[PDB]
């Protein structure tokens, strides 16, 4: 009866689920298990490039805390 | 190569203007002005004018060239030596300009121009938690009162003018 | 016919967008705020004829701030001599000009 | 940069699908099928120009989410309501002089 | 002063109004031939 | 051989896709249009076979000639058939489209639509029922299923 | 005036709703008690750096530390 | 690593567009007391594959074209715009997280009329050109209320960033303060994609869709799949902008499932509208725009300007 | 100065000489005129973003709005010319020689 439309809607829902889950896992993969740094403004980009300079390995996501100072 | 990206887009911009200014038809002229508006929007976007480039795509290419193609469809039938000859003339003059300014790193067509890429002339600071261009456009309402008055009045008058002169009575 | 109605009535119709040194939103300075302020405070009141000759130095500094023609010419000279010395093999770039030095902060 | 890669990828996929849609049905060599100004409306042009002028008024109206952050809120609110009022006055004059007729 | 070139010119109209120097005819039928399908209509549209 | 197997599977693929996605251009000439509309009714429901209802006249796979063809609409029928992209198919529906029918000896009736267009399936009746028309469409799909386009291409 | 208002609400309810919503948008911020707080929040949002003053000797209203009592306060924004 | 992300956006777009045809035919089947496809696959699952293979080997139609270059460029531009409308969509993290994503989508949807206009140019008919001008005039008409309703909504957001619009709707759905904007938005997005009851070129009320005349068209499958990419995209955009879901930054798939279910319900609401109403006459939806939607749009635009000032609720800039 | 300024100026002169040399149509003239406007838009925007002069960020929008209203007025003149003469050809606009 009416539930016969549900395999097509289920396939369409999996096809809509794949881009978002995919880009969430990719942003966690390429950023050290965290969210991608959103730099919409120039101050956020300055902090981000400062992270890229202070990490030493040319990667902004390598976070350095209190262990990096004496 | 990638440091010269605004220069490459500006050469594509001049090539597109030589394209539609040769005027094969207003149809292909409109198409050439659309492609030229897209690459000039890219030029604007690569200096940091994100809102102004989206104003290109949304207002210029989004409304006005739509109305030009709309009127070209409606007031012209549905689609040479002189066109292609003036096209290759403009293309050869622009590539000779490119060749001169890349071999000398200096040129003088009317004024003097540097031959390096235009990445050299940028600022080395930040703007904080705002865009300077966005806040200057937000200043249209707070600081630009008289400018809004004359622009809105000119648009109201423009509606009145087009309804008068297209009436035919 | 410059009917100066803005000064007769005391309204600010378009004086605000006129120069870069005016009051800006969120106190944003231009890239040549100081040079333009110096040229304007030089040329104020003295007339255009006296401003062409007595404010030449501030105006040349301000035009060269705007267009950066002498600056880009000097950088062209330094970079062309650098590439010529790489061509002759009399020079090698230092490690702080090759990207292998772990930038400051 | 990532945007330019994405635009080129979308353009490339579109062009590849267009190439498939034009050349793949040219593989199956079919039969050779040998058997065997425009009228002007003023109303189409007036709806196009009314769109264009209202889109210019929209172009004035677009920095309002940024304009609401100002310190001069009396002036900003006045000029905001004044631009939307002039858009409505353009619509009212477009109404009453029979501009919105037969494409209402 | 009528010359060789400027001799074919006429004086303008006195009211400065020139003569203007028609509508669409559509051959029309029903879109999908299921209900009617066998109708031919020769329209004379006016926009 | 390997190439014969590959072209056999590719013929199976294209025949599956063509028979299972038929789009009909029905001519609603006469009473058979009512019974085609019952072949699209919710009892018989041509749309569950992939046979869509109210397809475009231009991108259709089969021209169902459903009604009485007259001498005044013979060039219109042939012009529509000339506009159809291949593979185009013709199902004749009912006796007037088959052979003139109840109006066979008339001065103004084309005696069968096979005098004008090449016909693949003949669906007989006056009117042939919606079930009989759906039988004719399924027999058309069987006729599409046993096409050998790439096998004959490989053997020429 | 109420017969015409019912007449235009019977004939053209879209335009009546349009002029009513636009009339509220015009006249209502002059009557709202919270229109003042819009200004007070927009001017108290620190987009720039609070460039300090050289302590000459007599500036009692200007604090010497952020946690000093004097200076502009945002207790009204925390409370409202 | 980023190209993998671009592909995992744009290929499931094409697969969801393929199966929206199945979902439409099945739901329009069961809403019409009948079935949709259930013979071609198990429960109809092979109907989009069969239909796409059927369309992709079909002959070019009958005629030649007036302009070959625009006949090629109009499907290219339609598909390119219909794929670039997805890249700023926060789902919960967008592919291209740009500051002006709303404005980007408004501009790239304003550019979508060039495919209609250039396909009207490329066909040899002078009547298909008139029909294309009618469709262009319809689309640019409803772009006005798209822009102004969109602006009025983003006055409660603070910026043109689409990713901020998830943060805006954490306490309430934004349809609760702006349901008149939401209902005019939904009907205007319905009228953008030439969707019923506004599909005047695909149906009657049309000078050219008239049983055996001229006008070479392009490949139907590419225009059709660009149209359904536009439909799924505008339903996702309406979902993000009025029915915003809960975002947990440690479990983003909760947001992804939630807005996916809402977007599916909204695309099914498109399917349920098209199986319910007769079409407008062309001047009747011109009337519906200019004399009905647009005065309410300007009135509510004034209200949503003046309202965060009278309530002291101006949203943050950043 | 900057190299891109040469290209935007030369684009303005290209659309100038195209506007200053008619072939047949009036629509081609209006397209060259709006290409001139486009080059003005780009060049003003590059100056204003180049100098970080904040208040003139609203200037290219005002340029765009006024000259697109100008474009609408020119298209309306073209519509009236094409309704009078049947085409938008500029050689039909020749009655003012006498
Ligand atoms: C029709 C006119 C409607 C708007 C009327 C003025 C609205 C307003 O708030 O103006 C104050 C605004 C702004 O005032 P203000 O108080 O913000 O000015 C202080 C200076 N700034 C901006 C740096 C904070 O405009 C003016 O004062 C000058 C512009 C209007 C001048 C008169 C125009 C007459 C037009 C006749 C045609
Ligand atoms: C993007 C979606 C997925 C891709 C699309 C679907 C996948 C399948 C696409 C290919 C299908 C097969 C090729 C096109 C159809 C051929 C049918 C046909 O009539 O062929 C006869 C034609 C011609 O056969 P013929 O010589 O007998 O011609 C008969 C026609 N008359 C008499 C009018 C001349 O065959 C070919 O031209 C062969 C082309 C190559 C076949 C495939 C090779 C492998 C491809 C991988
Ligand atoms: C976003 C998620 C979903 C949101 C909801 C949308 C889904 C529901 C869709 C239902 C099916 C729609 C299918 C297509 C229908 C197309 C036709 C159509 O929409 O026609 C619109 C009709 C057209 O009107 P009409 O044609 O019926 O009326 C006749 C018109 N005249 C008289 C001119 C001839 O209505 C509108 O245009 C109304 C738009 C929305 C109005 C919102 C008003 C809000 C309330 C304001 C305040 C009122 C109180 C008074 C003042 C108080 C002051 C304090
Ligand atoms: C993001 C998710 C996207 C998912 C998209 C797809 C959704 C649907 C998923 C699959 C559903 C079931 C598919 C069943 C296909 C039909 C199989 C069938 O009946 O084949 C029979 C046919 C003839 O067999 P024969 O041997 O002649 O039989 C005689 C028996 N005495 O035999 C043949 O024709 C030969 C075998 C054909 C097998 C075809 C299998 C289906 C292919 C569909 C393409 C997509 C599949 C999924 C891809 C993504 C996941 C990997
Ligand atoms: C080296 C060797 C290989 C060489 C290259 C070939 C590769 C494989 C090609 C695909 C498979 C070829 C065979 C196709 C089907 C042939 C078998 C067949 O006819 O099965 C019939 C059966 C249904 O029987 P039917 O007669 O319809 O019954 C009515 C209901 N009782 O049919 C069914 O049950 C369903 C049949 C499904 C067919 C397969 C699924 C479609 C193809 C998927 C991949 C291609 C498309 C990719 C995506 C396209 C765009 C979306
Ligand atoms: C001052 C407030 C702000 C005002 C400016 C902002 C307005 C925002 C909305 C934009 C409206 C734009 C278009 C306005 C056009 C008005 C003229 C008009 O439409 O007149 C024609 C109409 C009769 O329609 P008809 O010609 O028959 O068309 C066929 C459709 N069935 O005629 C009518 O139906 C009569 C229309 C006028 C009467 C409406 C009265 C509404 C009263 C509501 C309560 C009071 C609201 C407060 C404001 C005071 C209003 C006087
Ligand atoms: C007939 C011809 C072919 C037709 C088919 C193909 C063309 C049509 C479809 C493609 C349309 C392309 C639109 C590209 C511009 C979109 C605006 C844009 O770039 O916005 C994103 C972003 C601004 O956002 P924001 O976050 O503020 O900036 C980043 C700071 N964190 O800004 C950025 O990220 C800027 C990135 C660098 C600049 C790239 C600009 C695009 C490349 C040049 C133009 C190419 C297209 C030319 C033709 C377009 C159609 C007219
Ligand atoms: C002097 C200033 C310009 C310098 C460059 C000249 C390029 C070569 C053109 C020389 C003149 C050619 C000519 O006859 O142009 C006339 C033509 C309009 O005439 P048409 O209607 O095509 O047919 C009658 C044939 N004369 O007019 C056109 O075709 C107009 C084409 C204008 C496009 C200019 C493109 C850039 C040219 C180089 C930069 C300046
Ligand atoms: C890439 C995948 C392409 C799938 C194409 C599916 C086309 C839709 C099939 C049925 C159909 C519907 C619903 C439809 O609405 C329509 O327009 C009236 C058609 O064209 C005549 C159709 O054929
Ligand atoms: S075969 Fe008979 S019943 Fe059928 S359409 Fe003809 S006249 Fe009518």
Rounded Cα gap, residues I90 and I92, in angstroms: 5
3-state class (DSSP) for residue B93: helix
Q: Structurally, how many domains does chain B consist of?
A: 1
Side-chain-side CA neighbours of H151 within 13 Å: the count stands at 29
Say if residues G26 and D84 touch (Cβ distance below 8 Å). no
Whole-number Cα distances in Å, A38 to H93, H104, H245:
10, 18, 20
Distance CA C80, CA C74 (A): 10
The continuous run of DSSP H or E covering F65 comes out as strand F62-66
Ligand number with the minimum distance to the CA of F28: 10
Other C-beta atoms lying within 10 Å of the C-beta of residue A68 = 10
Q: How far, in Å, CA of B135 to CA of D69, rounded?
A: 9
Cα of first residue to Cα of last residue in chain I, in angstroms, is 50
User: For H288, which residue in chain G has the nearest alpha carbon?
Assistant: G14
Determine the Cα–Cα distance for residues H146 and D1; give it in Å rounded to an integer.
29
Q: Inter-axis angle of helices H47-56 and H220-242, to 10 degrees?
A: 140
Q: How far is the CA of G32 from the centre of ligand 6 (A)?
A: 26
**Record: contact I85-E21, CB cut-off 8 A:** yes
The secondary structure of H21-43 as a DSSP string is HHHHHHHHHHTTTS----TTTGG
How many other CB atoms are found less than 10 A from the CB of residue F119?
18
For residues G42 and D73, the answer to whether their CB atoms sit within 8 Å is: yes
Cα gap E5→I98, rounded to integer Å: 13
Question: What residues contact H165, with CB distance under 8 A and at least 6 apart?
Answer: H90, H102, H154, H157, H174, H240, H241, H244
User: Residue I48: how many CB atoms within 10 A of its CB?
Assistant: 25
Phi, psi of F121 (to 5 degrees): -120, 135
Q: Detail the DSSP E strand segments found in chain B.
A: 106-108, 112-114
Task: Determine contact, residues A32/A57, Cβ cutoff 8 Å.
Answer: no
Q: Residue B70 and residue I75: Cα distance in Å, rounded?
A: 10
Measuring CA to CA, how many Å separate E11 from each of C20, E1, E17, I81, I97?
58, 13, 12, 22, 10
Q: What residues contact H27, with CB distance under 8 A and at least 6 apart? A: A5, H36, H268, H271, H272, H275
Count of C-beta atoms within a 10 Å radius of residue B29? 27
Asked whether the beta carbons of residue D73 and residue G42 sit closer than 8 angstroms, the reply is: yes
Closest-CA distance, H29 to chain F, in angstroms, reads 8
Q: What is the DSSP string of chain D?
A: -HHHHHHHHHHHHHHHHHHHHHHGGGTS---------PPP-HHHHHHHHHHHHHHHHHHHHTTHHHHTT-S-HHHHHHHHHHHHHHHHHHHHHHHHTT-S-S--
Q: How far apart are alpha carbons F128 and F149 in whole angstroms?
A: 31
The angle at the Cα of A34, spanning A31 to A36, to the nearest 5 degrees, equals: 60
**8-state DSSP, G62:** S
Instruction: Please tell me if the CB atom of residue H227 comes closer than 6 angstroms to any atom of ligand 9.
Output: no
Find where tokens 């090759």 sit: C98
Q: What phi and psi values does residue E26 have, to the nearest 5 degrees? A: -100, 135
Distances (CA, A) of H130 to F34, G25, H127: 34, 41, 5
Q: Which of D65, D66, D95, D101 to mutate to test the interface with B (most CBs of B within 10 A)?
A: D66
Neighbors of chain H with 3 or more C-beta pairs under 8 Å: A, B, D, E, F, G
The 10 Å Cβ neighbour count of residue D82 is: 15
Residues 6+ apart with CB under 8 A from H309: D68, D73, D77, G29, G32, G35, G38
DSSP per-residue codes, chain H: --HHHHHHHHHHHHHHHHHHHHHHHHHHHHTTTS----TTTGGGTTHHHHHHHHHHTSPP-S---S-HHHHHHHHHHHHHHHHHTSTT--SSS-SS--TTHHHHHHHHHHTTHHHHHHHHHHSS-HHHHHHHHHHHHHHHHHHHHHHHHHHHHHTTTSSS-STHHHHHTSSS-TTTT-HHHHHHHHHHHHHHTT-TTS--SSSSS-SS-SSS-------HHHHHHHHHHHHHHHHHHHHHHHSPPP-BTTBHHHHHHHHHHHHHHHHHHHHHHHTT-PPPPHHHHHHIIIIIIHHHHHHHHHHHHHHHHHTT-PPP--
What number of helices (H) and strands (E) belong to chain F? Answer: 6, 4
CATH number for the domain spanning B15: value is: 1.20.120.1200
Domain ranges in chain H?
1-318
Q: Which residue has the tokens 């039928």?
A: E29
Question: Per the omega criterion (within 30 degrees of 0), is the bond before A11 cis?
Answer: no
- For residue I60, give how far its alpha carbon lies from the nearest alpha carbon of chain D (Å): 11
Q: What does the alpha-carbon distance between residue F58 and residue F94 come to, in Å, rounded to a whole number?
A: 24
Alpha carbon distance F61, F144 (integer Å) = 11
Cβ contact D45:B117 at 8 Å: no
Biggest CA–CA distance in chain I, Å, is: 54
The Cα of H112 is separated from the nearest Cα of chain D by a number of Å equal to 14
Which residues between 5 and 44 in chain E have a beta carbon less than 8 angstroms from any beta carbon of chain D?
A: 22-24
Which residues in chain F (102-121) have CB-CB distances under 8 A to chain E? none
Q: Which residues in H lie closer than 8 A to residue G15 (C-beta atoms)?
A: 295
Burial class from Cβ neighbours inside 10 Å (0-12, 13-18, 19+) for residue H94 reads: buried
C-alpha angle C41/C46/C52, rounded to 5°?
85
List the domain boundaries for chain A: 1-70
Quote the ligand 9 centre to H121 CA distance (angstroms).
24
| CB-closest option in B30, B52, B123 to I45 | B52
**Nominal resolution in Å?**
3.0
CB of H183 within 6 A of ligand 9: the answer is no
Task: Using DSSP bridges, classify how beta strands E27-28 and E41-42 pair: parallel, antiparallel or unpaired.
Answer: antiparallel
Q: Mutation test of the interface with chain F: which of D28, D29, D36, choosing the one with the most F Cβ atoms within 10 A?
A: D28
Cα D66–chain centre separation: 23
Q: Give the span between the Cα atoms of B45 and I13, in whole angstroms.
A: 23
Number of domains composing chain D: 1
User: CA nearest F121: which of F103, F140, F134?
Assistant: F140
Under 8 Å CB-to-CB from F79, ≥6 apart: which residues?
Answer: H212
SS3 (DSSP) at F41 = coil
Supply D86's token pair: 């002039």
Which residue in I68, I72, I78, I88 has the most chain D C-beta atoms within 10 A of its own C-beta, making it the best mutation to test that interface? I72
H293 CA distance to ligand 6 centroid (A)? 13
Domains and CATH numbers, chain I: 1-86 (1.10.287.3510)
What's the rounded Cα separation, in Å, for the pair F39 and F33?
9
CA geometry: angle I10, I15, I20, nearest 5 deg: 120
Structural contact between residues H270 and H235, judged by C-beta atoms closer than 8 angstroms: yes
C-alpha distance from residue B108 to each of B98, C52, D84, F37, I3 (Å):
12, 26, 48, 77, 11
Structure tokens at I36: 């001139």
State chain C's maximal CA–CA distance in angstroms.
71
The continuous run of DSSP H or E covering F25 comes out as: strand F24-28
Q: Do chains H and F touch (3 or more CB pairs under 8 A)?
A: yes
Q: What's the CA angle centered on A16, arms A13 and A22, to 5 degrees?
A: 125
Q: By residue range, what is the domain housing residue D91? A: 1-104
Elucidation technique: cryo-EM
Residue carrying structure tokens 């055996």:
H212
Q: Taking a C-beta distance cutoff of 8 angstroms, is the pair B90, B98 a contact?
A: no
CA G3 to chain centre: 38
Both tokens assigned to H171:
């306490």
SS3 state of residue F116? coil
CA dist H74 to C5, H69, H217, H228, Å? 54, 9, 11, 16
- Cβ within 8 Å, pair E37-F29: yes
CA torsion sign for G8, G14, G17, G22 is negative
The β-bridge relationship of strands F121-123 and F89-93 is: parallel
Q: Nearest to residue D68, comparing CAs of H148, C13, G26, H152? A: H152
The number of the ligand nearest the C-alpha atom of D70 reads 1
CA G18, G19, G25: angle at the middle one, nearest 5? 95
8 Å CB contact between B52 and I61: yes
CA end-to-end span of chain E: 49
Separation between Cα atoms, residue D101 and residue D41, nearest integer Å: 12
Count CB atoms within 10 A of the CB of residue F14. Answer: 18
Residues in chain D: 104
Q: Identify the H or E element spanning B159.
A: helix B145-165
- The ligand 10 atom at the shortest distance from the C-alpha of residue F128 is 4
Q: What does each C-alpha distance from I89 to B26, H126, I93 come to in angstroms? A: 12, 20, 8
Task: Using a CB–CB cutoff of 8 Å, tell me whether G76 touches chain H.
Answer: no
Is residue F127 reached through a cis peptide bond, with omega within 30 degrees of 0 on the bond before it?
yes
Report yes or no: C69 at the I interface, CB cutoff 8 Å. yes
Residue H164 CB coordination number (10 Å): 23
Classified as helix, coil or strand, F123 is strand
- Whether the bond between H197 and the residue before it is cis, its omega within 30 degrees of 0, is yes
What is chain C's alpha carbon radius of gyration, rounded to the nearest angstrom?
22
What would you report as the CA-atom Rg of chain A, rounded to the nearest whole angstrom? Answer: 20
**I81 within 8 A of I88, measured Cβ to Cβ:** yes
Beta-carbon contacts of C91 under 8 Å, excluding residues fewer than 6 positions away, are C82, C85
Task: Identify all chain D residues contacting B137, using CB atoms and an 8 Å cutoff.
Answer: 63, 66
Of C20, C67, C72, the CB nearest to I53: C20
Q: Which long-range contacts (CB under 8 A, 24 or more apart) does A31-37 make?
A: A31/A61, A32/A61, A32/A62, A32/A63, A34/A61, A35/H93, A35/H249, A36/H93, A36/H97, A37/A61
Sorted by sequence, the CB contacts under 8 Å of residue B135 that are 6+ apart come out as C25, C26, C28, D66, I54, I57
């Amino acid at each position: 009866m009416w539930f016969e439309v549900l395999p097509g809607i289920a396939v369409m829902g999996v096809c809509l689920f794949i881009p978002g889950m995919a880009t969430a896992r990719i942003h966690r993969f390429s950023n050290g298990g965290r969210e991608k740094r959103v730099a919409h403004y120039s101050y956020q980009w300055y902090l981000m490039e400062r992270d890229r300079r202070v990490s030493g390995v040319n990667r902004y996501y390598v976070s350095k805390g209190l262990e990096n100072i004496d | 190569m990638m440091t010269y990206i605004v220069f490459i887009l500006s050469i594509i911009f001049v090539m597109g203007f030589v394209g539609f200014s040769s005027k094969p038809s207003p149809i292909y002229g409109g198409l050439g002005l659309i492609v030229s508006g897209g690459v000039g929007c890219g030029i604007v976007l690569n200096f940091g004018g994100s809102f102004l480039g989206l104003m290109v795509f949304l207002i210029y290419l989004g409304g006005m060239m739509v109305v030009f193609g709309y009127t070209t469809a409606m007031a012209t039938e549905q689609y040479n030596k002189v066109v292609l000859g003036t096209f290759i003339t403009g293309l050869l003059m622009e590539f000779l300009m490119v060749y001169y300014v890349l071999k000398d790193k200096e040129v003088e067509i009317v004024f003097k121009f540097n031959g390096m890429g235009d990445w050299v002339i940028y600022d080395t600071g930040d703007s904080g938690f705002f865009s300077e261009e966005a806040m200057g456009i937000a200043a249209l309402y707070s600081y630009g009162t008289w400018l809004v008055i004359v622009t809105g009045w000119s648009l109201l008058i423009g509606v009145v003018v087009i309804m008068e002169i297209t009436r035919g009575n | 016919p410059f009917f100066d109605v803005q000064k007769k009535l005391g309204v600010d119709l378009d004086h605000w967008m006129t120069i870069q040194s005016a009051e800006q939103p969120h106190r944003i300075p231009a890239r040549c705020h100081a040079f333009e302020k110096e040229w304007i405070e030089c040329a104020h009141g003295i007339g255009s004829i006296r401003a062409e000759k007595e404010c030449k130095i501030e105006f040349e500094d301000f035009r060269e701030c705007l267009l950066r023609q002498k600056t880009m010419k000097r950088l062209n000279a330094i970079k062309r001599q650098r590439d010529k010395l790489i061509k002759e093999g009399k020079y090698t770039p230092p490690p702080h000009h090759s990207g292998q030095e772990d930038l400051r902060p | 940069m990532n945007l330019m890669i994405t635009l080129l990828t979308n353009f490339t996929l579109a062009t590849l699908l267009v190439t498939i849609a034009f050349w793949l049905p040219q593989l199956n060599v079919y039969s050779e099928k040998t058997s065997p100004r425009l009228p002007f409306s003023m109303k189409f042009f007036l709806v196009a120009i009314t769109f264009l002028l209202f889109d210019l008024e929209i172009a004035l109206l677009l920095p309002l989410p940024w304009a609401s952050q100002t310190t001069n809120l009396n002036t900003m609110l006045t000029m905001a309501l004044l631009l939307i009022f002039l858009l409505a006055v353009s619509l009212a004059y477009e109404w009453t002089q029979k501009g919105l007729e037969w494409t209402e | 002063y009528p010359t060789k070139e400027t001799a074919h010119w006429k004086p303008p109209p006195w009211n400065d109004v020139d003569p203007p120097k028609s509508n669409l005819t559509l051959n029309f039928g029903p879109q999908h031939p299921a209900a009617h399908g066998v109708l031919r209509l020769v329209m004379e549209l006016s926009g | 051989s390997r190439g014969e197997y590959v072209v056999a599977k590719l013929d199976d693929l294209i025949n599956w896709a063509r028979r299972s996605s038929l789009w009909p251009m029905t001519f609603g000439l006469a009473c058979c249009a009512v019974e085609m509309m019952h072949m699209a009714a919710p009892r018989y429901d041509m749309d569950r076979f992939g046979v869509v209802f109210r397809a475009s006249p231009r991108q259709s796979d089969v021209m169902i000639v459903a009604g009485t063809l007259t001498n005044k609409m013979a060039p219109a029928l042939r012009k529509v058939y000339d506009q159809m992209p291949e593979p185009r198919y013709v199902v004749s529906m009912g006796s007037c489209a088959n052979g003139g029918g109840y109006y066979h000896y008339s001065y103004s009736v084309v005696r069968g639509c096979d005098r004008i267009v090449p016909v693949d399936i003949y669906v007989p009746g006056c009117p042939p029922t919606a079930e009989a028309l759906l039988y004719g469409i399924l027999q058309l799909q069987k006729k599409i299923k046993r096409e050998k386009r790439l096998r004959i291409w490989y053997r020429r | 005036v109420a017969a015409f208002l019912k007449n235009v609400w019977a004939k053209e309810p879209v335009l009546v709703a349009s002029f009513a919503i636009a009339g509220l948008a015009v006249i209502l911020p002059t009557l709202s008690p919270y229109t003042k707080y819009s200004l007070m929040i927009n001017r108290a949002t620190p987009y720039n750096y609070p460039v300090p003053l050289r302590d000459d000797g007599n500036m009692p209203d200007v604090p010497s530390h952020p946690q000093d009592p004097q200076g502009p306060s945002l207790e009204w924004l925390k409370r409202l | 690593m980023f190209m993998i992300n671009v592909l995992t956006l744009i290929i499931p777009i094409l697969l969801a567009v393929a199966f929206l045809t199945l979902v439409e035919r099945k739901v329009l089947g069961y809403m019409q007391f009948r079935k949709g496809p259930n013979v071609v696959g198990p429960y109809g699952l092979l109907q989009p594959i069969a239909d796409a293979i059927k369309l992709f080997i079909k002959e070019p139609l009958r005629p030649a074209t007036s302009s070959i270059s625009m006949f090629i460029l109009a499907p290219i531009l339609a598909l390119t715009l219909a794929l670039t409308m997805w890249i700023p969509l926060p789902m919960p993290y967008p592919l291209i997280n740009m500051n002006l994503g709303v404005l980007f989508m408004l501009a790239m949807s304003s550019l979508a009329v060039y495919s209609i206009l250039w396909s009207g140019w490329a066909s040899n008919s002078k009547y298909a050109l008139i029909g294309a001008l009618r469709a262009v005039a319809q689309t640019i008409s409803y772009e006005v209320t798209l822009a102004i309703i969109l602006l009025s909504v983003l006055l409660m957001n603070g910026s043109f960033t689409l990713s901020t619009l998830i943060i805006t709707q954490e306490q309430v759905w934004l349809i609760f303060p702006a349901w008149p904007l939401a209902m005019m938005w939904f009907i205007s997005t319905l009228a953008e994609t030439n969707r019923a009851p506004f599909d005047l070129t695909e149906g009657e009320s049309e000078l050219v869709s008239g049983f055996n005349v001229e006008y070479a068209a392009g490949p139907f499958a590419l225009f059709f799949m660009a149209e359904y990419a536009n439909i799924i995209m505008m339903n996702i955009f309406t979902t993000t902008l009025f029915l915003g879901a809960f975002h947990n930054p440690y479990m983003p798939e909760l947001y992804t499932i939630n807005f996916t279910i809402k977007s599916l319900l909204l695309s099914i609401t498109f399917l349920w509208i098209r199986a319910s109403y007769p079409r407008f006459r062309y001047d009747q939806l011109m009337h519906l725009l200019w004399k009905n939607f647009l005065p309410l749009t300007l009135a509510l635009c004034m209200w949503h300007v003046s309202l965060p000032i009278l309530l002291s609720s101006i949203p943050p800039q950043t | 100065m900057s190299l891109v300024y040469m290209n935007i100026m030369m684009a303005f002169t290209v659309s100038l000489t195209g506007l200053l040399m008619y072939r047949s149509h009036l629509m081609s003239s209006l397209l060259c005129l709006e290409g001139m406007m486009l080059s003005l838009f780009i060049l003003a925007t590059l100056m204003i973003l180049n100098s970080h002069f904040t208040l003139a960020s609203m200037m290219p929008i005002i340029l765009l709005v006024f000259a697109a209203c100008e474009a609408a007025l020119g298209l309306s003149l073209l519509v009236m010319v094409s309704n009078t003469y049947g085409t938008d050809y500029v050689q039909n606009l020749n009655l003012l020689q006498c």
